[PDB]
Coordinates of C-alpha atoms in Angstrom, one line a residue:
Chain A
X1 CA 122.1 80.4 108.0
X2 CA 123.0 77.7 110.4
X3 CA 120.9 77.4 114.0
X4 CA 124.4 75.7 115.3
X5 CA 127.6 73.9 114.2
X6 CA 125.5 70.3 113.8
X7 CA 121.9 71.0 113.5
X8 CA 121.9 73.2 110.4
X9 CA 118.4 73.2 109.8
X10 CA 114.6 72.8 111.5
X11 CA 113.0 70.4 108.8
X12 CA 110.0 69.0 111.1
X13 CA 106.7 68.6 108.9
X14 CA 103.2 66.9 109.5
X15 CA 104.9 63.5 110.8
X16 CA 108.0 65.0 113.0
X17 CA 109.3 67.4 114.9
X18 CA 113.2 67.0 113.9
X19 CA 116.4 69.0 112.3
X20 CA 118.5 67.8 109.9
X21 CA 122.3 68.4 109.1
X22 CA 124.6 67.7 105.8
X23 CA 128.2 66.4 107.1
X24 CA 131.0 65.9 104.8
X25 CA 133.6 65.0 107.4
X26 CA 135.4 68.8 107.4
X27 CA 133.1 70.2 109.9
X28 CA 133.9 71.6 113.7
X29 CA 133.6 68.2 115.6
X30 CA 134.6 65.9 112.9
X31 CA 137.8 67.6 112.3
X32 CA 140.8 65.6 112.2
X33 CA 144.6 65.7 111.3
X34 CA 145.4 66.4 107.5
X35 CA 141.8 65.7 106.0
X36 CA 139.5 62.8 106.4
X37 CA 138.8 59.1 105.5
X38 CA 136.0 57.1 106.7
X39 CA 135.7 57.0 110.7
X40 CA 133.1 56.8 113.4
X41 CA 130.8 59.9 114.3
X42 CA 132.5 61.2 117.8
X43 CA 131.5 60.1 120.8
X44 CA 130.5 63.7 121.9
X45 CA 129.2 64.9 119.2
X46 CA 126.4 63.0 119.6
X47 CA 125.8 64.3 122.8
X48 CA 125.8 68.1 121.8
X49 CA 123.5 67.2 118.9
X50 CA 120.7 65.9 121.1
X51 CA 121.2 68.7 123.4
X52 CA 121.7 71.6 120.5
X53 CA 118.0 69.9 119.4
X54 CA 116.3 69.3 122.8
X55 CA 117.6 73.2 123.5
X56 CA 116.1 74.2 120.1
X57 CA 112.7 72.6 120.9
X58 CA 111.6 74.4 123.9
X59 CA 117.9 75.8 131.9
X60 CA 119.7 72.9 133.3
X61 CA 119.0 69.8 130.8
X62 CA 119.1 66.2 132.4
X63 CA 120.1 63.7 129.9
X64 CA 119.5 59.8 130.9
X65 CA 119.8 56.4 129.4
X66 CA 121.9 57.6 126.4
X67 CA 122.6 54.8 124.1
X68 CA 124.3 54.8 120.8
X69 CA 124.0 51.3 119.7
X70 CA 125.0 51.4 115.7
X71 CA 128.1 53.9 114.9
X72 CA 127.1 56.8 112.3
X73 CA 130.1 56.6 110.0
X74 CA 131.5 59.9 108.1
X75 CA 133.8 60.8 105.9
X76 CA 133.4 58.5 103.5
X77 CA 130.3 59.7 101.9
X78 CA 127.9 62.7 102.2
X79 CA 125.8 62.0 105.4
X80 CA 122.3 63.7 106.2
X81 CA 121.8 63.1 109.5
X82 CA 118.1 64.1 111.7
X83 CA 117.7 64.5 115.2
X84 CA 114.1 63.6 115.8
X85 CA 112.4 64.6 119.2
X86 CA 109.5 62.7 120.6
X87 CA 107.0 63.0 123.6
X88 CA 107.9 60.5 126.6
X89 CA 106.1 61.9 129.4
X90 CA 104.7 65.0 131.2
X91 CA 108.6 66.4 131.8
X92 CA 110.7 64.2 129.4
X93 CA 111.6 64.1 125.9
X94 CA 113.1 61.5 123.9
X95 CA 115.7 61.8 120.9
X96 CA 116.7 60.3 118.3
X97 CA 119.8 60.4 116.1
X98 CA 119.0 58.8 112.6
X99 CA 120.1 58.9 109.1
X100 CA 119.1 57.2 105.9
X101 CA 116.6 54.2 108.2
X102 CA 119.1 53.4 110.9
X103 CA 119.0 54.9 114.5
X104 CA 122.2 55.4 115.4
X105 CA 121.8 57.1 119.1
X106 CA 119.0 57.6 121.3
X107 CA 118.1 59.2 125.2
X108 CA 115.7 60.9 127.2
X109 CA 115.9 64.4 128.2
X110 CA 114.3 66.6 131.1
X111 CA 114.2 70.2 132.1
X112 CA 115.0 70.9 135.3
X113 CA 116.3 73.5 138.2
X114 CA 119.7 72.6 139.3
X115 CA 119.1 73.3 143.4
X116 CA 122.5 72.4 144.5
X117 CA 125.3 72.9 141.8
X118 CA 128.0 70.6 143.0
X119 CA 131.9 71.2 143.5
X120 CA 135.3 69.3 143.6
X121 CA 138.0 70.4 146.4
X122 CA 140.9 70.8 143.8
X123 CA 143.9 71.5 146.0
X124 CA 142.7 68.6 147.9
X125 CA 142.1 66.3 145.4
X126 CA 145.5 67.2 144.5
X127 CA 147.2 66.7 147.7
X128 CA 145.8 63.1 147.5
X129 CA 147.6 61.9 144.5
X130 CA 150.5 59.4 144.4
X131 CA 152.2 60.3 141.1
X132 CA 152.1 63.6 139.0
X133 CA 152.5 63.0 135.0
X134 CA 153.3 65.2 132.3
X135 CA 151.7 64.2 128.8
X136 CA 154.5 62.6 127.5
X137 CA 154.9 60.4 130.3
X138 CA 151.0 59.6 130.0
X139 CA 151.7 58.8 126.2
X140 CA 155.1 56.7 127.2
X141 CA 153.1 54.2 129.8
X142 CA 150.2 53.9 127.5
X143 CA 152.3 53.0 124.3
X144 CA 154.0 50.1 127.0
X145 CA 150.5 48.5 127.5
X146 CA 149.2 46.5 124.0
X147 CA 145.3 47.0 124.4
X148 CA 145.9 50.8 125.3
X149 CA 147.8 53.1 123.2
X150 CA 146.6 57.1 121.1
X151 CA 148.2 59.8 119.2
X152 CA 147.8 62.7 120.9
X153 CA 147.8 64.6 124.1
X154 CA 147.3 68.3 123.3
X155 CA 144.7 68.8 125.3
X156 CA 146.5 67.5 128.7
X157 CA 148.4 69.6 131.0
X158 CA 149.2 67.6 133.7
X159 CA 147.5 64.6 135.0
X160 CA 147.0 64.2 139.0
X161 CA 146.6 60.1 140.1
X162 CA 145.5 59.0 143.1
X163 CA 143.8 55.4 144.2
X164 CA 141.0 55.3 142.3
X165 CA 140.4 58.6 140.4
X166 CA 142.8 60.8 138.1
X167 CA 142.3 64.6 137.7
X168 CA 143.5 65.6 134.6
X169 CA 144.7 69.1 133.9
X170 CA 143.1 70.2 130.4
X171 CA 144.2 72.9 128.2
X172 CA 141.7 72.0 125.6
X173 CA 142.4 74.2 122.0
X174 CA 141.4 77.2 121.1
X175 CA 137.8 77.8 119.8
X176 CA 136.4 81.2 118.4
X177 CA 134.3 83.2 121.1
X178 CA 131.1 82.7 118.7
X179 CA 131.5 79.0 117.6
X180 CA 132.3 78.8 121.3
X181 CA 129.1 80.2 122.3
X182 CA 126.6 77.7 120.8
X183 CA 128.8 74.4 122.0
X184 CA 128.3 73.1 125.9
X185 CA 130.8 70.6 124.6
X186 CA 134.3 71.3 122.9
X187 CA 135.3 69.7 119.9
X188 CA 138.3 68.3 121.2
X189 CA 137.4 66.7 124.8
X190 CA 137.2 63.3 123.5
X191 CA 141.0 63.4 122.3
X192 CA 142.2 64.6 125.8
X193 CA 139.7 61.9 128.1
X194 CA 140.5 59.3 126.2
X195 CA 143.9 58.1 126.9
X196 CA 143.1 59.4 130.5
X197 CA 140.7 56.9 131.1
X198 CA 142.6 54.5 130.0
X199 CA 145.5 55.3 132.0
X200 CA 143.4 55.5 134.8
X201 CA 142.1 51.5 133.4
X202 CA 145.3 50.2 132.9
X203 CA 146.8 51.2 136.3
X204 CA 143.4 49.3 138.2
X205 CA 144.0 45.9 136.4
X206 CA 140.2 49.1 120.2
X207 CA 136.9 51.7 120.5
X208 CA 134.2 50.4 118.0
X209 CA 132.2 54.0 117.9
X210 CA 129.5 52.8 120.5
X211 CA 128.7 54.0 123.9
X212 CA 126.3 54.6 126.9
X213 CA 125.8 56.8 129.4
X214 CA 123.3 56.5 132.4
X215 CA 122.9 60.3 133.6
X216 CA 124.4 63.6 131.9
X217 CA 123.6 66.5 133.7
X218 CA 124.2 69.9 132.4
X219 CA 124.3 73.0 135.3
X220 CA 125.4 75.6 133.2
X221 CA 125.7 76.9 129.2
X222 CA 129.1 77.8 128.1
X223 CA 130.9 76.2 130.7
X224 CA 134.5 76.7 131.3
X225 CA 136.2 73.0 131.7
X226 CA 139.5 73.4 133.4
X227 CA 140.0 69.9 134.7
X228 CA 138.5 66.2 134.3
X229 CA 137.9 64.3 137.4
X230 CA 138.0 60.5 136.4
X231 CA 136.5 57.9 138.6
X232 CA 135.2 54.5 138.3
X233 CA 131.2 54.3 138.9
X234 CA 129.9 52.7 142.2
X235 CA 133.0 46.9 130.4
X236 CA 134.8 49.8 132.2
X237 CA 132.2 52.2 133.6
X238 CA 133.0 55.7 134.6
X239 CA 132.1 58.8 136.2
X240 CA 133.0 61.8 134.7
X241 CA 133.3 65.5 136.7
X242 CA 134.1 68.6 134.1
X243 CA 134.7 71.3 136.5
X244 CA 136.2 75.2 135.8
X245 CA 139.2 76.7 137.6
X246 CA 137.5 76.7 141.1
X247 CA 136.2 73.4 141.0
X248 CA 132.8 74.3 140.4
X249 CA 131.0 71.4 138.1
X250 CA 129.4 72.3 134.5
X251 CA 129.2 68.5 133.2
X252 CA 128.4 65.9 135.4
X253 CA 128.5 62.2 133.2
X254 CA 127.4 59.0 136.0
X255 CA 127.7 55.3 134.1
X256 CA 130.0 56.2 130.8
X257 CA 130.6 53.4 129.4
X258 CA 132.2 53.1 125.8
X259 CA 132.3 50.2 123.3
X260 CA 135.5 47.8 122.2
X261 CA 136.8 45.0 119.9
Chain B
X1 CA 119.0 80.5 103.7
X2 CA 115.1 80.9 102.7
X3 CA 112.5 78.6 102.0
X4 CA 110.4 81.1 100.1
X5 CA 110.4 84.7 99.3
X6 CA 107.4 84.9 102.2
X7 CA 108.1 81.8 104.6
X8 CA 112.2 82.5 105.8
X9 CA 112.6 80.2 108.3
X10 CA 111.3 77.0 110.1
X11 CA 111.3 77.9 113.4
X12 CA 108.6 74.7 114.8
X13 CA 109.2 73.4 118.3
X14 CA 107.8 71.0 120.8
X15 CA 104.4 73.5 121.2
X16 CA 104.2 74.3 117.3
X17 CA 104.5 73.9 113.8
X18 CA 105.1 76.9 112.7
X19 CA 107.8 79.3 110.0
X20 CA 108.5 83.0 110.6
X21 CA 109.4 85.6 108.6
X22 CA 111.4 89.2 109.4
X23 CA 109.7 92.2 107.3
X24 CA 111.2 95.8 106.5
X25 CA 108.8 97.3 103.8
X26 CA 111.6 97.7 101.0
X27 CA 111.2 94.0 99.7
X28 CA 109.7 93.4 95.8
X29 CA 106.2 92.3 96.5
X30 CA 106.1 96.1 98.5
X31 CA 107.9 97.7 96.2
X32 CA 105.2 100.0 94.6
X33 CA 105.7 102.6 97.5
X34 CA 104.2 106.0 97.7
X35 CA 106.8 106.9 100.3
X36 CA 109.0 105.1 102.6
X37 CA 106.1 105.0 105.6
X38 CA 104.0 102.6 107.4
X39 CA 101.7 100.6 105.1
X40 CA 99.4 97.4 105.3
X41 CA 100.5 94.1 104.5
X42 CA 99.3 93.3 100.9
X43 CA 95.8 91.2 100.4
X44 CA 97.2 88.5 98.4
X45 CA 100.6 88.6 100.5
X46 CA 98.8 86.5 103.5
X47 CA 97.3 83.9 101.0
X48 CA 101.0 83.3 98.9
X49 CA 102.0 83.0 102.8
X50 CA 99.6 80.6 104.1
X51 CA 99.8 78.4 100.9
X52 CA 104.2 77.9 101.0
X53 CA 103.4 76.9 104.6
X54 CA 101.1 74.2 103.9
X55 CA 102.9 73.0 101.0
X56 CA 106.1 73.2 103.5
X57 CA 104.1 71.2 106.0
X58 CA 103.6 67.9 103.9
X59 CA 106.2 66.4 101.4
X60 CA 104.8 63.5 98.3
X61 CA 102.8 66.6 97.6
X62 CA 99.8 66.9 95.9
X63 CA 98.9 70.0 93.1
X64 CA 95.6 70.5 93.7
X65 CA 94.5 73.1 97.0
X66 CA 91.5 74.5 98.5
X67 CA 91.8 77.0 101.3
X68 CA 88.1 78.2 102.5
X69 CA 86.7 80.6 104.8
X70 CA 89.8 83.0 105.0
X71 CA 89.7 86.2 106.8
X72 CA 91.7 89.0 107.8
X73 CA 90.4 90.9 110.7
X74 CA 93.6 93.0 112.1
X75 CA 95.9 94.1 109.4
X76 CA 99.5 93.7 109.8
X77 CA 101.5 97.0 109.6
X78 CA 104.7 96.9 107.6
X79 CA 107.5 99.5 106.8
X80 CA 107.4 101.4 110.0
X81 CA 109.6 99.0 112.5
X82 CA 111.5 95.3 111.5
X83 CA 108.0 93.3 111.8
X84 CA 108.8 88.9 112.4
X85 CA 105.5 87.3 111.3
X86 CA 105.0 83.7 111.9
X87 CA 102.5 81.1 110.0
X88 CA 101.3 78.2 112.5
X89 CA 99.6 74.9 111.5
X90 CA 97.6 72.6 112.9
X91 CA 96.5 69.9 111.7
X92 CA 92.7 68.5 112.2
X93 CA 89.8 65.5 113.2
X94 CA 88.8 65.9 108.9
X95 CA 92.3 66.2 107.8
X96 CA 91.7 69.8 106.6
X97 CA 94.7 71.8 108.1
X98 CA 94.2 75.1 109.6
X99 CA 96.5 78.0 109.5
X100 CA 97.3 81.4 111.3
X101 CA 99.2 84.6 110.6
X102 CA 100.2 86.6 113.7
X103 CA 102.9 88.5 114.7
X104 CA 104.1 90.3 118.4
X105 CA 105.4 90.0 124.2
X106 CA 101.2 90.4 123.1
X107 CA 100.6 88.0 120.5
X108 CA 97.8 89.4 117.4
X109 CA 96.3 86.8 114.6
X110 CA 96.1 88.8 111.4
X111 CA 95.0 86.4 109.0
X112 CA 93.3 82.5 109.7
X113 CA 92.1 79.7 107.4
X114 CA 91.4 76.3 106.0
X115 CA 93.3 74.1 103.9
X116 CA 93.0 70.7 102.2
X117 CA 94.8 69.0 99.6
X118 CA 92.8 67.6 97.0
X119 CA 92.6 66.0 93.2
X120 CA 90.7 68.7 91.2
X121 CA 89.4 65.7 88.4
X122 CA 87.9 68.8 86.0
X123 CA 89.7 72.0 86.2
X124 CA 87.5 74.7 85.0
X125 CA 88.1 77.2 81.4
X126 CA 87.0 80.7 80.1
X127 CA 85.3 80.6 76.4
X128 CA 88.0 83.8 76.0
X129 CA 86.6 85.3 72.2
X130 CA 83.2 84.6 74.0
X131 CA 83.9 86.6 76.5
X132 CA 85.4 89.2 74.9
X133 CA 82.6 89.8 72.1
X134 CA 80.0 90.4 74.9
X135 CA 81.5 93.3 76.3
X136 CA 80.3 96.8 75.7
X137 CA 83.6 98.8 76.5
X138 CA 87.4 98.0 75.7
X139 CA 89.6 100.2 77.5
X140 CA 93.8 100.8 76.5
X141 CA 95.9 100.5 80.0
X142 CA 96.0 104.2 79.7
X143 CA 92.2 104.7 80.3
X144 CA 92.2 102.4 83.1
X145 CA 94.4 104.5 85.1
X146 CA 93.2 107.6 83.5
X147 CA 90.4 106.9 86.1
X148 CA 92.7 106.2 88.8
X149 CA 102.0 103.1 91.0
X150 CA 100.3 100.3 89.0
X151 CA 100.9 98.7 85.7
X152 CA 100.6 94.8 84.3
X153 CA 97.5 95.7 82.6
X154 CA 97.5 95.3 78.5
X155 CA 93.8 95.8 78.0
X156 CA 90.3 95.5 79.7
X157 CA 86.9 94.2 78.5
X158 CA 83.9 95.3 80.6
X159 CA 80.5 93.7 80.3
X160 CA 77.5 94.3 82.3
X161 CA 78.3 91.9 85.0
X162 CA 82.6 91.5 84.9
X163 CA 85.7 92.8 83.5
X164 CA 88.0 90.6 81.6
X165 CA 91.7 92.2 82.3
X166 CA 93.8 91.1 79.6
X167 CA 97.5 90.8 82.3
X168 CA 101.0 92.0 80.8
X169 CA 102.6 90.0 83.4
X170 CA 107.2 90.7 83.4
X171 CA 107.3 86.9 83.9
X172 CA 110.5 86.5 85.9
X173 CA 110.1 82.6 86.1
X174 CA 113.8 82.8 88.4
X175 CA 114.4 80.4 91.1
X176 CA 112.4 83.3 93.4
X177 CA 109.5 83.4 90.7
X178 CA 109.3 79.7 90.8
X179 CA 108.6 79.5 94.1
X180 CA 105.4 81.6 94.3
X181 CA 102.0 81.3 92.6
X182 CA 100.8 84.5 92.5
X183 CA 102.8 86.8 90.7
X184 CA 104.2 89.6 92.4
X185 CA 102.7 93.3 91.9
X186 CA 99.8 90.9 91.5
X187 CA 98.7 91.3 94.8
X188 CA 98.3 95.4 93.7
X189 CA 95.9 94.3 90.4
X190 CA 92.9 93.8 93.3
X191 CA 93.1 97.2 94.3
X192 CA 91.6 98.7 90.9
X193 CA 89.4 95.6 90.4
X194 CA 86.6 96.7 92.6
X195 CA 87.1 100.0 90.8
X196 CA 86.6 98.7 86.9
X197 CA 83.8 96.7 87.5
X198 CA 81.4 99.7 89.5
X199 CA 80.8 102.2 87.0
X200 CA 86.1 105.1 100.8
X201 CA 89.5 103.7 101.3
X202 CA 90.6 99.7 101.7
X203 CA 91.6 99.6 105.6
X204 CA 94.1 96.2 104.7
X205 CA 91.4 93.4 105.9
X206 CA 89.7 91.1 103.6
X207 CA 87.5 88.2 104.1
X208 CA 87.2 84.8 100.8
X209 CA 85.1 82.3 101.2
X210 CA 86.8 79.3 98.7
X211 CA 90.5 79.5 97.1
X212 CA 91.5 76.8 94.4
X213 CA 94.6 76.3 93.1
X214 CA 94.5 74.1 89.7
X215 CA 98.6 74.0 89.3
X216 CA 101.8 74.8 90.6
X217 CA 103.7 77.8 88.9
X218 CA 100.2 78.6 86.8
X219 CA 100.5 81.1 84.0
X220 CA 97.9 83.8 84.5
X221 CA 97.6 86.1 81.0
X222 CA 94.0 87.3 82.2
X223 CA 91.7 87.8 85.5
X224 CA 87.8 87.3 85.0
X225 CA 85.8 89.4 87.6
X226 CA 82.2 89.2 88.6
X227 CA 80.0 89.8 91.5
X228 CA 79.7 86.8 93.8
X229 CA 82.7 97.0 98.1
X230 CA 81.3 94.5 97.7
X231 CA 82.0 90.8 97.3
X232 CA 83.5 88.7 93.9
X233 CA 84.7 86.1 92.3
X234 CA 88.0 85.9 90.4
X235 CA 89.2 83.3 87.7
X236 CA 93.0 83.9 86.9
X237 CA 93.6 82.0 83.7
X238 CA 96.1 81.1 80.9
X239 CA 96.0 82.6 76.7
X240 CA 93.8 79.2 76.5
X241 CA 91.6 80.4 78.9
X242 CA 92.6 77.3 81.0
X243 CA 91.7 78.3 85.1
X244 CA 95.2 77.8 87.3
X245 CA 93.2 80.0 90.3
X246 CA 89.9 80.6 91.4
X247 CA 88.8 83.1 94.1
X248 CA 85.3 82.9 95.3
X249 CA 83.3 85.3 98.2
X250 CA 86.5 87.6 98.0
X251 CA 85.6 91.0 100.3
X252 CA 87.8 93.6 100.6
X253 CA 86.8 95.9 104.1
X254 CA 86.7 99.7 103.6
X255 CA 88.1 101.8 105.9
X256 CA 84.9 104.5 105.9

């Protein structure tokens, strides 16, 4: 009796409209290698909770001026955490992620009609690119730099550079067909963007569990994300292209920025 | 899983406050069946229903409330088909909170009310032995259905004016029993009552006028009726004669 894998339950009343969720640190998103330990909430995860609520409360979903500001922390203790959704205007919501009371991230949201879905040229794109890496050698340059260096690089394929952008070949792990089916986002898409981004940092010139984001927009449920087109947006900001087989976009993310010591 | 044996799910969004419930027919509170067909939803069913929501919709919570000028217009039919009934809320200018039953791509209201929260400073008893010496008839549980499934029924005193029905209530008191304040097979004990105290068919609607609840969980050992079919008034009390419910302008609709 779960609406989705983190909003577990619709608990609005008199005063809200909002749905609240029990973690312990084991769950879908939060999982990690060989149990837990206190950590930060991840990053997308707090993405797919405002959407799973937003979603609830009511195709393509518009996400904009995402913020979260003060890192929900997990695995320590058991956290409840609500999802709170307010009126904003005539065609926008606004969401709140809270627990105890601290809000930890907050956004606006709109419905609209995706008129133009757009598209990357993959074999192009390809074409373009100076180097070709495996994962390893991703992992062996990013160990070399101080600031930048992870642990792993399952998800990665092969990673396509080119001035300016990097297209990153994901094979992201496997998730059951019907765990699958409620998530836009996959658990494990953090793990595998992560050192590309700063690969693609390092190569043009730590995380404290903050972040923002400008503009999120959504085109499709379920969709299939084959490749990661990284760019720099027109302290580190980035654009973010999530993109199938044939290059047409599910997830587009304009101004991602996330948070360092 | 369920929030109450008659509210299973939240289900509020951005145009409502609301809880729904799916249905079949074979659950306890229907379980006195004459056959596995189509029936009406019980009387007392849409007032247990309306009451969890409320209480669901606030929460500190207060014991004492009064829903009036309830009414039941179009009967909900359970047993045939997998029925999903929901219970809205909206809250008012007063702060009195109104309430609907309805069910169904064209949308039917079965049931609608009032409801307020409120302090009840004297909660109203029954002089019991007095009530009992006035009466001119006792009749064993056997006599009572002599004249008429149905059980829960020890004794009853008739007067000229009301019966006194002495209740042999199973008294679960489980985690599911907890959760409701009318009993269940309770909801069945208003289907003679119109029947003991006169001495056609009930077509599932009902209109009440005032509803008081004096306590969460109350113990109800006896029902007082009188004459406010036509319409009455109903005291549910404890041995001590102490009042946990109190029904008044309660009209059940006949079907000819």
């Amino acid at each position: 009796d779960i609406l989705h894998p983190l909003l577990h339950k619709n608990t609005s009343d008199l005063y809200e409209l909002r749905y609240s969720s029990s973690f312990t640190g084991q769950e879908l998103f939060m999982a990690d290698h060989l149990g837990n330990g206190q950590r930060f909430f991840p990053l997308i995860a707090y993405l797919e909770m405002a959407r799973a609520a937003v979603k609830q409360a009511a195709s393509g979903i518009r996400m904009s001026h995402v913020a979260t500001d003060d890192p929900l922390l997990v695995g320590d203790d058991l956290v409840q955490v609500h999802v709170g959704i307010y009126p904003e205007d005539t065609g926008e919501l606004a969401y709140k992620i809270y627990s105890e009371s601290v809000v930890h991230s907050h956004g606006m949201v709109e419905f609209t009609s995706f008129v133009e879905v757009p598209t990357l040229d993959l074999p192009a794109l390809q074409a373009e690119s100076s180097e070709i890496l495996t994962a390893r050698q991703c992992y062996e340059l990013l160990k070399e730099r101080g600031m930048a260096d992870h642990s792993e690089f399952q998800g990665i394929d092969q990673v396509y550079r080119a001035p300016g952008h990097v297209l990153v070949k994901l094979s992201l792990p496997s998730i059951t067909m019907e765990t699958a089916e409620q998530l836009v986002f996959h658990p494990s898409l953090l793990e595998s963007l992560l050192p590309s981004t700063r690969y693609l940092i390092t190569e043009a010139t730590q995380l404290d569990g903050t972040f923002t984001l400008e503009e999120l927009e959504i085109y499709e449920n379920h969709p299939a994300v084959k490749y990661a087109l990284i760019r720099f947006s027109d302290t580190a900001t980035l654009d973010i292209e999530l993109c199938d087989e044939a290059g047409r976009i599910g997830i587009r993310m304009r101004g991602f920025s996330m948070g360092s010591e």
